Structure formats: structure tokens, C-alpha cells
Amino acid sequence: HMLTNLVAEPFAKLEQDFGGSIGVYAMDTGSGATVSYRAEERFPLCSSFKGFLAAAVLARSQQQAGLLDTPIRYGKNALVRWSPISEKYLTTGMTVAELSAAAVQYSDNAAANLLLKELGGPAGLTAFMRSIGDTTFRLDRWQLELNSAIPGDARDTSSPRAVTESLQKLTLGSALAAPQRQQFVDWLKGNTTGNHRIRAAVPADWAVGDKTGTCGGYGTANDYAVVWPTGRAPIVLAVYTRAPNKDDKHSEAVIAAAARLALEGLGVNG
Ligand SMILES: *C(=O)[C@@H](NC(=O)/C(=N\OC(C)(C)C(=O)O)c1csc(N)n1)[C@@H]1N=C(C(=O)O)C(=C)CS1
Structure with missing residues (x-):
């Protein structure tokens, strides 16, 4: 508690203007200081599970030296809405590493479900998260x-x-x-889907990797990122939103604004 929320920030006004709930946790890995707002509430993961999926694949590759270069062939039935990379390689296959990069960097939906299969499904990914000490994460459904x-x-x-x-x-x-x-x-740093979220609060001369998520309905979208400000320790942060009513819109601008407040609360000049 000692180093949590040392400086207050107007998250409540931001979420009231948004019309929903915003959840933020940000960690200065140098000092251990944190910014925390609704940080222990649950929010839909949406596509943000895919970053952790790619990490689970990488963890497995430590024991399976051939995993990343394994070719995966798939049928048209694997292609679902928003599969911008995997649809271009339907007739050729892609490697596990390529599927991982597509899932992380284009939020390719088909690529994510193919990788989930390789890991033993939602319970397998959840098990990986338990193995690193995360008792909160739960993936329940195929994707x-x-x-x-x-x-x-x-x-x-x-x-x-x-x-x-x-x-x-x-x-x-x-x-x-x-x-x-x-x-x-490196996969997070190459993400293409987050330019209007945490990255919009981060100066261009700082390195940043992120993974986004967006769900249809209920004002539900999110982003998490590692940020390397020059000359100081990296920051890790997550911004999740949801809203009470089905037709409520999500907002990328609200995510960017919450990230700005988190950085300001940590005393990070940006
Ligand atoms: C992950 O979040 C993916 N999201 C989706 O497939 C869903 N909706 O997509 C949009 C475009 C928002 C829709 O209106 O259908 C979805 C998943 S579970 C649920 N109830 N809806 C992809 N990832 C991203 C991202 O931000 O990374 C998107 C912008 C949408 S596709």
C-alpha cells in the first residue's frame, strides 16, 4: 500500500464521462510504485488472451526445440471473422511461430484458435497462467x-x-x-492494432509492446503494454473497460487517456 496511488488521478471522472467502468494497474518496475483503479475487478479478456497464449507457446518451445518451426495446415472451417493473416496462407499452411506473430500483431482470430488447440485449449492456457503464479486469469471457451x-x-x-x-x-x-x-x-513491439490505445500516450522515442482486445457490445475493450522510457526502468500496465448496457460503445481514446493518467500518477514525464 505504501507505494500505491501516491498521487491521485481523476479516473472516476474519466469513467463517468465514458459511461462505464475502467480498470487500471500500472507498475514502475524501478521503484515498485503503482497506480491502481478497479485493479482487482474482472473484465473480459477479449483478444488480450492471445499475448499470454503466445507466451505459453514460447514456454513450451523451451522443452520442444522444434515447436516454433512446426508447419500447421488448416482448412477453410478454421477461418473465422477477422483472420487477416491466416486467410492468406490457407492454401500453404503457416508455422507455429507465424501463427503466434499473427495472433499477437494482427489479433488474427483463426491463428489464435489453432494455437489454443496446440496447448490443450482454454484449460491448457489457464494452466500455464497458474504455473507463473496467476490465480485470477481464466479462459473458458474456445475462440x-x-x-x-x-x-x-x-x-x-x-x-x-x-x-x-x-x-x-x-x-x-x-x-x-x-x-x-x-x-x-519483439512480438509485442511489432503489434499493429494498438496505435490508438496505450501507445497514443507513449512518446514515439520510447519502446513499447502491447496486445489489444475488443469485444462486441457493452463498451468492452482493453490493452496491456510494457513501456521502456529512456533512462529509467520499464513500466508495465493494463487498461480494461466495460460498460453496463449492450449498445454502449467502447472508446480507444478513453484507453489512451487512462494510460496517460497512469503514467502521470507514476511521475513518468511523457
Ligand atoms: C479480439 O479482441 C478480436 N475481437 C473480436 O473478434 C470481437 N469483436 O470484434 C469486433 C470488431 C469488436 C466486433 O464488433 O465484432 C469479439 C471477441 S469476443 C466478443 N463478444 N467479441 C479481434 N481483436 C481486436 C483487438 O482489438 O485486438 C479487434 C479490434 C476486433 S477483432
């Missing part, structure tokens, strides 16, 4: 079908705090071996 994200349903959710803690362990801590850690970081 071919357009799973609902309705309020109060704990399936396919985590908390901003657990997301941030797990992301820190995987990108900066010891949960992955060094080569795999850097590959996870």
Missing part, C-alpha cells in the same frame, strides 16, 4: 465462435492487476528463458 461478454459473466476474464503482474513476469522477470523472453517482447 472460433463469437463468445458473448455480458456483465457479470466471469468466463474469459482476468483483472488489470493480474494481467500486469503476469505480463511483468513474462517480459521482464524470469518466467521465460532469455531468448524466449526477447521473442515475446
Whole structure:
């Protein structure tokens, strides 16, 4: 508690203007200071599970030296809405590493479900998260079908705090071996779907990797990121939103604004 929320920030006004709930956890890995707002509430993961899926694949590759270069062939029935990379390789196959990069960097939906199969499904990914000490994360459903994200349903959710803690362990801590850690970081750094979220609060001359999520309905979208400000220790943060009513819109601008407040609360000049 000592170093949590040392400086107050107007998260409540931001979420009231948004018309929903915003969950934020941000960690200065140098000092241990944190910013925390609704940080232990559950929010839908949406596609943000895919970053952790790629990390689980990398963890497995530490024991399975051939995993990343394994070719995966798939049928047209594997292609679902928003599969921008895997649809181009339907007739050729893609490697596990390519599927991982597509899932992380284009939020390719078909690629994510193919990788989930390789890991033993939602319970297998959940097991990986338990293995790094995350007792909050839960993935419950396969990801071919357009799973609902309705309020109060704990399936396919985590908390901003657990997301941030797990992301820190995987990108900066010891949960992955060094080569795999850097590959996870590199995939996050190459993400193309987050330019209007946490990255919009981060100066262009700082390195940043992120993974986004967006669900249809209920104002539900999110982003998590590792940020390397120059000359100081990295920051790890997660911003999740939801809203009470089916037709409520999500907002990328609200995510960016919450990230700005988190950085300001940590005293990070940006
Ligand atoms: C992951 O979040 C993916 N999201 C989706 O497939 C869902 N909806 O997509 C949009 C475009 C928001 C829709 O209106 O259908 C979805 C998943 S579970 C649920 N109830 N809806 C992909 N990832 C991203 C991202 O931000 O990374 C998107 C922008 C949408 S596709």
C-alpha cells in the first residue's frame, strides 16, 4: 500500500464521462510504485488472451526445440471473422511461430484458435497462467465462435492487476528463458492494432509492446503494454473497460487517456 496511488488521478471522472467502468494497474518496475483503479475487478479478456497464449507457446518451445518451426495446415472451417493473416496462407499452411506473430500483431482470430488447440485449449492456457503464479486469469471457451461478454459473466476474464503482474513476469522477470523472453517482447513491439490505445500516450522515442482486445457490445475493450522510457526502468500496465448496457460503445481514446493518467500518477514525464 505504501507505494500505491501516491498521487491521485481523476479516473472516476474519466469513467463517468465514458459511461462505464475502467480498470487500471500500472507498475514502475524501478521503484515498485503503482497506480491502481478497479485493479482487482474482472473484465473480459477479449483478444488480450492471445499475448499470454503466445507466451505459453514460447514456454513450451523451451522443452520442444522444434515447436516454433512446426508447419500447421488448416482448412477453410478454421477461418473465422477477422483472420487477416491466416486467410492468406490457407492454401500453404503457416508455422507455429507465424501463427503466434499473427495472433499477437494482427489479433488474427483463426491463428489464435489453432494455437489454443496446440496447448490443450482454454484449460491448457489457464494452466500455464497458474504455473507463473496467476490465480485470477481464466479462459473458458474456445475462440472460433463469437463468445458473448455480458456483465457479470466471469468466463474469459482476468483483472488489470493480474494481467500486469503476469505480463511483468513474462517480459521482464524470469518466467521465460532469455531468448524466449526477447521473442515475446519483439512480438509485442511489432503489434499493429494498438496505435490508438496505450501507445497514443507513449512518446514515439520510447519502446513499447502491447496486445489489444475488443469485444462486441457493452463498451468492452482493453490493452496491456510494457513501456521502456529512456533512462529509467520499464513500466508495465493494463487498461480494461466495460460498460453496463449492450449498445454502449467502447472508446480507444478513453484507453489512451487512462494510460496517460497512469503514467502521470507514476511521475513518468511523457
Ligand atoms: C479480439 O479482441 C478480436 N475481437 C473480436 O473478434 C470481437 N469483436 O470484434 C469486433 C470488431 C469488436 C466486433 O464488433 O465484432 C469479439 C471477441 S469476443 C466478443 N463478444 N467479441 C479481434 N481483436 C481486436 C483487438 O482489438 O485486438 C479487434 C479490434 C476486433 S477483432
